[PDB]
Ligand binder design. Structure first.
Ligand SMILES: [Cl-]
Ligand SMILES: [Mg+2]
Ligand SMILES: [Zn+2]
Length: 138
């Protein structure tokens, strides 16, 4: 396991800073009663030889998902039983994920942009953009 090498690698924790996230959640067709708000969220991204791991956790929601990815290579995961296709790529120093949710005819853009000490995550679906800011853990 390697925890450095790219600016977006590391252990990231959500902050109080969030923008337009309910509009993004609504545009995905998800209920705000269970997916809105600003619950403490962790992103951990590290390298394991020939691939990366990306662990997402939302402890209040009993959610933990470990995503295995190789840059530029498609992968799949599941949420409940919604299949999710993804492909992570680098845009220079930033990390992007292209996400298909075929059952719902949705395409989602995720971006991870590290401004130094801080990580800005941008979420886009169609013309709806949300942002959330993360800090390095501890
Ligand atoms: Cl498509
Ligand atoms: Mg997040
Ligand atoms: Zn796209």
């Amino acid at each position: 396991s390697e925890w450095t090498g790219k600016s977006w690698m590391g252990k990231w924790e959500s902050t109080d800073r969030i923008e337009n996230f309910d509009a993004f959640i609504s545009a995905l067709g998800l209920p705000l009663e269970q997916y809105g708000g600003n619950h403490k969220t962790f992103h951990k991204i590290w390298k394991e030889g020939d691939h990366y791991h990306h662990q997402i956790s939302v402890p209040d929601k009993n959610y933990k998902n470990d995503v295995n990815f190789k840059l530029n290579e498609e992968g799949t995961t599941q949420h409940n039983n919604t299949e999710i296709k993804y492909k992570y790529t680098e845009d220079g120093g930033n990390l992007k994920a292209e996400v298909h949710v075929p059952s719902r005819n949705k395409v989602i853009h995720d971006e991870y942009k590290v401004n130094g000490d801080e990580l800005e995550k941008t979420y886009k679906v169609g013309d709806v953009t949300a942002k959330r800011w993360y800090k390095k853990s501890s």
